[PDB]
Amino acid sequence: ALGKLQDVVNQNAQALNTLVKQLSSNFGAISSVLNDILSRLDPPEAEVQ
Amino acid sequence: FVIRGDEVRQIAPGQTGNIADYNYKLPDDFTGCVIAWNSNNLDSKVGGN
């Protein structure tokens, strides 16, 4: 019966997780971590990715 | 200023090198024009300039 409510929660929760997981995505960049790119590439090169 | 031919590429936005790092750096948002012309007849000495 409470699904309607539970449903909502999950959606919201679900969204956040997706959002968080997007931080683990390259999107074409060499890496998904900014610090790694900065440490491994100079700003002229790093900025591209 | 005066450089060598190989260094000509270094004179540009988003460039790295001895000249760019230590001698003359351009901003990433640089607006202007770069004009480089050989000056061998003017800047070369037989014994070494």
From Swiss-Prot, chain A:
Consequence when changing Q11H: In strain: Omicron/BA.1, Omicron/BA.2, Omicron/BA.2.12.1, Omicron/BA.2.75, Omicron/BA.4, Omicron/BA.5, Omicron/BQ.1.1, Omicron/XBB.1.5, Omicron/EG.5.1
Coiled coil segments of this chain: 6-49
Effect of S39A: In strain: Alpha/B.1.1.7
Effect of L38F: In strain: Omicron/BA.1
Superkingdom per UniProt: Viruses
Described purpose of this protein according to its UniProt entry: Subunit of the fusion protein that is processed upon entry into the host cell. Mediates fusion of the virion and cellular membranes by functioning as a class I viral fusion protein. Contains a viral fusion peptide that is unmasked after S2 cleavage. This cleavage can occur at the cell membrane by host TMPRSS2 or during endocytosis by host CSTL. In either case, this triggers an extensive and irreversible conformational change that leads to fusion of the viral envelope with the cellular cytoplasmic membrane, releasing viral genomic RNA into the host cell cytoplasm.
Name by which UniProt lists this protein: Spike protein S2'
